[PDB]
């Protein structure tokens, strides 16, 4: 039952988030002021991972001096760290392939593709494992699964709709849907191979996917036989379903409790919101993880770090974040906000449901709402901004600047209007 | 100072600091258990021969410890239980390499007047006691405990989560010539397992069980005897820190109607430090145990807390395994048991 | 005729004062019980909204929907086996919950009328004057009063203020709907809910609907959110002959705790509901209820686990008994909104003479 | 015509006609000219000028109580469905009636309220009233033994004055300030109050430090009483501690200074609860607790 292997897949969903990624790495990314790899670390080591495997390619230096940096190259770490160089930017079968070439694989090991932060204790799913492995020889990957907000209306990137067992808790059908974003399809067709062997059809778009595995050592032999096999959910389960070797089973594990892969930017949002709230139960941010940290939760789900500076007469909100070192002006109002470390805040500022990363500079008077920022990025004077404007890395926007609804800024100095020099597209400067 | 030094020697350390913020370890007589087979460790495989570096450095690792878990006070406590007892023997073998020592009582006034050997064994000793102490609290609460609660009185209980303050109940209601009615407030976000554990153990032994709501305390305030607090952690004003919801305002109620308070702990589980603030030291619970569905919880900002703070002003013993001491004396028993250096680490 | 006696659970040695027994399922009855009575007896033993308040209205609306549907005998005239039939009502109403003090009032008010109107006018002629007067009745006693209740009550709070509120009061929940709406403040809005129901979380939702900024606590917790809150507003049942407050379960708690933390307790209530029977402490008159509702482990109303509890009978002495209906201290409350405007419930009984 | 021009007259007057009779009998000057017979005309433009005395008025309560006297008297002149001239009569000639009113009253409280002085005595006075001063007075006419207590009071320096109105008598007196107020309830025997203004619920309307007095005379046991004339309720329910009509500050923070001006800003008027009050006086009879309530049902009849 002992000793445990961790592959994780990195290099992934870089791109998905559009603004960023262009000079530093997509898990580098701070959640709640700390990079979403040790979110995933975390996680690891409370189910009770010995080797850590991971994948960088892209920005890849900056991954592996990161991990230098962490917490985990010291020798009492329960876990060491070994990273897979491959060809810049390939699918997850291509990786399969490269290392079950390499031959590292023993018994039962582990993959997540992106980074995912759960209260969910890992011990039960690994005897259910098990268990179900003792059921019957030809058993392969476990899938899991979480309880969505009561209806998946604003849930629009992930459609993905379950067919389940009430008995055996088998995965039939994977199927994604445009619906409510695009009415033009509404028909989905199911294979009826399963009808009398299951009976007890379960059929729920009401799930979040999580993409967190347990697998076995038959999976990197099946990746190696059919390399025409690009995905893993969309192709893959729908593929081992589908007949193509007899008698083969997959788990999809039922959780009551909190589980959600970070994809797209609204999800990362609600994620964040529900990280600021008491969703998560052990995962707060008081705890300490990265030990560098000195949070102290406060009344009305306010938090503070240690050596927090603010001016008086400033009122603040719920669900709120500050980091260490920070400086705050008069007449400011913080509402549903993470922001970072080091950070300079100005004078006269009125800030709802926006984020901000670690050392931004915010000119006096300016009003930002439900408006992300990134690390080292200066905001100027008289800076009016709507929902959903993600703005890059190192962009220094000047005095005087309204922009509209998802005005996205690149971080690099391509297609999109805004970039990073002085003056984004508001008279014609940039590289 | 790092655990750069002690990572091959001790690796117990970061295990602990792994069972503190993930909160694998539960309830202060394990935390306490644990430290103690720390620094068990830590002389047991330690050199030294210097004796000033070896006490500052163990200032150093406690200090540590309760930055990486502000609520694991029993860690604290320990760590500056031996560290007292360390001091008085390194004070006591100074006097003998130099060459009244002795003017009235054990006094304080650090203020006023200035100024090879078998102290590790003391060390390993000295750690030893400090078990055997934690290990039998109960015989010495019972003896002064089981002296003040009467026949046809009746019992609200906050906090079910102690295992002292059960077990006191369970000796009292052994003896046959005492009878008494139980009413136990439920604390529903986190207590209501326990409580309802609690609510069993009680019919086992056949006591007269009454479950309460938090709501329906009030109800009863008039009718009541008597009111046991299940407390944590104890401070130098009196007040505590208890095992979770549902005792301030059932304090607030006692108050209001006059009904006396009673608290069971012990010495270890004793603080030397202030509470300032309530606001730093209680911890706050999980907000997923109210309510249901995430996107109602974008709107709805629910609040819960797991620890409950009591100020002194409600209750009026705290019965140990020394005796029955007022919360205006309490500090005395703390000075007797830990340094005024020993304090901030 | 009915199901009387045989109970679930202990007879319990402490409180014993009031029936713990009923008709759940529909077995063995009378058949000639209008099936609107029949109804509302099956909604309100296992009801989540009412409180005081729309019980009373549903009540009257029932009556005018029998009066409509009464038809005088030819033989037997109109106050003959009327008051019989109601008594029939009233004894199943009991049988499923005990009434309310605005009940009483209303049964009072019919009762009345019944004597005032002799048997000499045609009947179709007498029962569309009658529904007429029981409207204007409601309309001037209910909605009407409740609309000066909630200009009462705008005058007397302050410009962007926190409020902590408990229960499902019906007047409470359209006072703040009114601020949010009409008045537009920046209220804060704080809900506290017991164990048995959760009628604050039934407030809340509907406060969400409305899109309030809304905090939704519990009894346990307390002495965190306090330490914030300006005025409290509790759901009012009845006010008797002294000025004690007979409400809801957690609502004395709240109470003494805001007479401590400086800011205090005001009550919105109606000139129908107060009564001239009087007590001093919880346990002369309490509302008791099964400990079926007490089963379930956390979250939700219907959940149906595995858990710890779930024997009441066959366990040597387990008594999980919770109140519904308790008693706040006199002073504790300062501000009472009636029909008469204003008047400290010091004073209480200013209105019971005045009629 | 004018109302404000006319309450502004009363400079070195005052006394004996108080301060809201002043006001009623203005009132009444300024019906008895322009016809009191139209309801239209007359009522609405009472309502305006009363309006008006509002918006003028700074730091003052019972000028609103007063009105509400004059108004429900005119309305229920004329509720017997009388001649509409014998009616307006009985009307114009009950203004100065209602001030010849403040004389009797006078008399009557006079004579009852010195039983409350029992022989020899020590009391402590706060927030002077021409009722409170009338009882005292009118003691040292009856030659009973009392001692006195004077109360730093600070809205205009009052106590000061205070002191200086006793010592016109041949009352022996010294100085006690408000912060060591709680120092003196022990050697004090009764705490005499008088109200700028009582409340529907049966708490007071007061001056700069009142509820402080009312709270540790509570605390002490010693009793605490009310002494006025019947004319000073308003239909007003202060639900809080600090919540009060006012013309000024309720209670302001002020920035930096240097040349010190900005800083004296505290609550001038104080409101204390229905318990701390142990007996009230009026020419109403002996009552206290829910008979000011009763008594403002009876005017409203609401």
């Not at chain 1, 000047?398 to 209007?417: E, G």
């Not at chain 3, 003959?80 to 499923?96: E, F, G, P, V």
């Not at chain 4, 040349?259 to 800003?265: F, G, H, K, P, Q």
Request: proline fraction near 4%; charge should be negative; include cysteine.
């Amino acid at each position: 039952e002992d000793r445990l292997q961790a592959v994780v897949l990195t290099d992934s969903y870089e791109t998905r988030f559009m603004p960023l990624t262009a000079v530093k790495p997509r898990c580098l990314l701070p959640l709640a002021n700390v990079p979403l790899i040790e979110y995933t670390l975390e996680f690891l080591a409370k189910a009770g991972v010995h080797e850590v495997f991971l994948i960088c390619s892209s920005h890849a230096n900056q991954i592996n001096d990161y991990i230098e940096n962490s917490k985990w190259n010291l020798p009492w770490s329960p876990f060491k760290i070994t990273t897979i160089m491959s060809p810049e930017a390939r699918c997850t079968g291509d990786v399969m392939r490269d290392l079950d070439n390499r031959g590292i694989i023993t018994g039962d090991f582990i993959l997540v593709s992106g980074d995912v932060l759960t209260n969910i204790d890992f011990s039960k799913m690994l005897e259910f494992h098990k268990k179900m492995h003792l059921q019957d020889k030809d058993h392969i990957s476990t899938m899991c699964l979480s309880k969505a907000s009561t209806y998946p209306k604003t849930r629009t990137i992930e459609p993905a709709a379950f067919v389940l067992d009430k008995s055996t808790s088998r995965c039939i059908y994977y199927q994604d849907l445009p619906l409510p974003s695009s009415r033009e399809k509404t028909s989905i067709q199911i294979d009826p191979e399963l009808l009398d062997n299951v009976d007890e059809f379960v059929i729920r778009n009401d799930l979040i996917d999580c993409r967190i595995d347990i697998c076995t050592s038959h999976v990197p032999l099946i990746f190696q036989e059919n390399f025409d096999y690009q995905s893993l959910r969309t192709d893959f389960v729908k593929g081992v379903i589908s007949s193509d070797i007899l008698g083969k089973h997959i788990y999809a594990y039922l959780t009551d409790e909190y589980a959600v892969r970070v994809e797209s930017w609204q999800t990362y949002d609600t994620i964040s919101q529900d990280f600021l709230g008491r969703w998560c139960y052990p995962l707060v941010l008081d705890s300490n993880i990265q030990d560098d940290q000195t949070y102290s939760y406060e009344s009305r789900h306010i938090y503070k770090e240690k050596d927090v500076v603010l001016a008086q007469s400033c009122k603040i909100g719920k669900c709120t974040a500050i980091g260490s070192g920070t400086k705050i002006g008069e007449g400011t109002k913080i509402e549903n906000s993470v922001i970072g470390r080091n950070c300079q805040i100005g004078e006269n500022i009125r800030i709802k449901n926006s984020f901000i990363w670690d050392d931004c500079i915010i000119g006096n008077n300016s009003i930002i709402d439900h408006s992300l920022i990134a690390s080292n990025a200066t905001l100027g004077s008289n800076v009016r901004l709507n929902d959903g404007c993600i703005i890059g890395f190192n962009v220094k926007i000047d005095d005087n600047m309204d922009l509209d609804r998802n005005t996205k800024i690149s971080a690099s100095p391509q297609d999109l209007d805004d970039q990073t020099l002085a003056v984004s597209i508001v008279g014609d400067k940039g590289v | 100072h790092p655990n750069a030094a002690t990572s091959d020697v001790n690796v117990t350390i970061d295990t602990f600091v792994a069972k503190l913020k993930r909160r694998q370890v539960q309830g202060s007589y394990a935390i306490a258990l644990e430290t103690l087979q720390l620094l068990m460790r830590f002389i047991s495989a330690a050199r030294w021969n210097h004796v000033n570096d070896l006490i500052e450095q163990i200032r150093d690792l406690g200090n540590s410890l309760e930055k990486a878990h502000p609520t694991a006070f029993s860690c604290g406590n320990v760590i500056r239980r031996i560290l007292a007892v360390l001091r008085d023997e390194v004070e006591e073998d100074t006097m003998s390499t130099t060459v009244v020592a002795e003017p009235l009582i054990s006094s304080m006034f650090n203020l006023l007047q200035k100024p090879k050997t078998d102290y590790r064994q003391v060390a390993i000793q000295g750690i030893k006691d400090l078990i055997d102490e934690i290990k039998n609290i109960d015989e010495g609460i019972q003896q002064i405990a089981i002296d003040l609660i009467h026949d046809h009185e009746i019992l609200l209980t906050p906090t079910p989560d102690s295992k002292t303050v059960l077990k006191f109940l369970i000796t009292a209601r052994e003896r046959s010539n005492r009878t008494f009615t139980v009413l136990v407030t439920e604390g529903f976000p986190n207590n209501t397992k326990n409580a309802h554990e609690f609510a069993k153990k009680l019919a086992q032994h056949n006591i007269e069980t009454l479950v309460v709501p938090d709501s329906a305390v009030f109800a009863l305030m008039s009718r009541v005897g008597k009111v046991i607090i299940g407390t944590k952690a104890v401070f130098v004003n009196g007040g505590t820190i208890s095992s979770n919801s549902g005792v301030s305002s059932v304090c607030e109620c006692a108050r209001e109607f006059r009904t006396p308070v009673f608290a069971v702990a012990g010495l270890y589980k004793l603080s030397p430090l202030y509470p300032f603030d309530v606001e730093k030291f209680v911890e706050f619970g999980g907000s997923q145990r109210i309510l249901p569905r995430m996107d109602p919880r974008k709107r709805l900002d629910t609040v819960n807390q797991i620890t409950d703070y009591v100020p002194p002003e409600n209750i009026d013993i705290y019965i140990t395994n020394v005796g029955g001491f007022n919360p205006s004396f309490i500090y005395r028993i703390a000075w007797d048991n830990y340094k005024q250096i020993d304090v901030h680490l | 005729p009915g199901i009387s006696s045989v109970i679930p659970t202990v007879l319990e040695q402490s409180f014993d004062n009031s029936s713990l027994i009923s008709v759940k399922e529909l077995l063995l009855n009378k058949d000639l019980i209008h099936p609107s009575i029949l109804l509302l007896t099956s909604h309100l033993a296992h009801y989540k909204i009412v409180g005081s308040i729309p019980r009373c209205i549903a009540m009257l609306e029932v009556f005018q929907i029998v009066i409509k549907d009464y038809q005088t005998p030819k033989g037997t005239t109109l106050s003959r086996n009327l008051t019989s039939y109601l008594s029939h009502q009233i004894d199943l109403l009991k049988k499923a919950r005990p009434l309310s003090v605005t009940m009483g009032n209303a049964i009072r008010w019919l009762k009345q009328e019944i004597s005032l109107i002799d048997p000499s006018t045609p009947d179709k002629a007498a029962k569309k004057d009658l529904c007429e007067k029981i409207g204007q009745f409601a309309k001037e006693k209910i909605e009407l009063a409740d609309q000066l209740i909630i200009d009462n009550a705008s005058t007397q709070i302050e410009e962007s203020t926190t409020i902590v509120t408990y229960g499902s009061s019906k007047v409470l929940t359209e006072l703040l709907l009114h601020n949010a709406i009409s008045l537009k403040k920046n209220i804060k809005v704080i809900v506290v809910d017991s164990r048995p129901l959760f009628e604050g979380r039934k407030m809340a939702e509907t406060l969400r609907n409305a899109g309030v900024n809304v905090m939704y606590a519990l009894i346990t917790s307390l002495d965190t959110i306090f330490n914030d809150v300006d005025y409290v507003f509790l759901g009012a049942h009845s006010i008797l002959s002294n000025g004690f407050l007979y409400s809801r379960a957690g609502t004395a708690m709240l109470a003494m705790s805001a007479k401590r933390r400086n800011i205090p307790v005001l009550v919105c209530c109606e000139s129908l509901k107060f009564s001239q029977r009087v007590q001093l402490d919880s346990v002369t008159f309490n509302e008791l209820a099964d400990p079926n509702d007490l089963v379930n482990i956390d979250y939700e109303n219907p959940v149906e686990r595995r858990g710890n509890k779930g024997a009441l009978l066959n366990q040597f002495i387990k008594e999980r008994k919770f109140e519904k209906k308790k008693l706040a201290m006199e002073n504790k409350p300062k501000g009472n909104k009636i029909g008469g405007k204003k008047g400290s419930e010091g004073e209480s009984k200013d209105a019971s003479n005045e009629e | 015509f004018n109302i404000t021009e006319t309450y502004l007259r009363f400079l070195e007057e005052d006394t004996e006609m108080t301060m809201p009779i002043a006001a009623i009998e203005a009132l009444v000057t300024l019906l008895r000219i322009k016809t009191p017979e139209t309801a239209a005309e007359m009522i609405n433009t009472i309502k305006s000028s009363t309006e008006e005395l509002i918006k003028s008025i700074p730091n003052s309560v019972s000028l609103r109580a007063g009105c509400d006297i004059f108004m429900r008297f005119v309305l229920r002149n004329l509720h017997l469905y009388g001649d509409w001239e014998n009616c307006k009569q009985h009307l114009i000639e009950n203004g100065q009636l209602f001030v010849s009113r403040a004389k009797k009253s006078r008399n009557k409280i006079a004579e009852i309220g010195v039983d409350f002085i029992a022989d020899d005595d020590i009391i402590l006075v706060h927030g002077y009233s021409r009722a409170v001063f009338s009882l005292l007075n009118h003691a040292a006419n009856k030659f009973i033994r009392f001692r006195c207590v004077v109360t730093e009071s600070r809205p205009s320096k009052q106590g000061n004055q205070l002191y200086t109105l006793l010592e016109q008598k041949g009352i022996p007196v010294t100085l006690i300030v408000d912060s060591a107020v709680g120092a003196v309830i022990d050697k004090v025997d009764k705490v005499f109050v008088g109200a700028e203004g009582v409340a529907e619920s049966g708490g007071i309307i007061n001056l700069v430090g009142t509820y402080s007095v009312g709270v540790l005379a509570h605390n002490a046991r010693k009793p605490f009483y009310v002494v006025t004339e019947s004319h000073k309720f308003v239909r007003m329910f202060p639900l809080s501690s600090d919540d009060l009509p006012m013309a000024g500050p309720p209670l302001d923070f002020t920035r930096r200074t240097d040349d010190l001006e900005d800083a004296l800003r505290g609550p001038t008027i104080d409101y204390t609860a229905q318990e701390y009050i142990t007996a009230l006086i009026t020419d109403l009879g002996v009552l206290t607790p829910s008979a000011v309530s009763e008594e403002l049902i009876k005017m409203w009849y609401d």
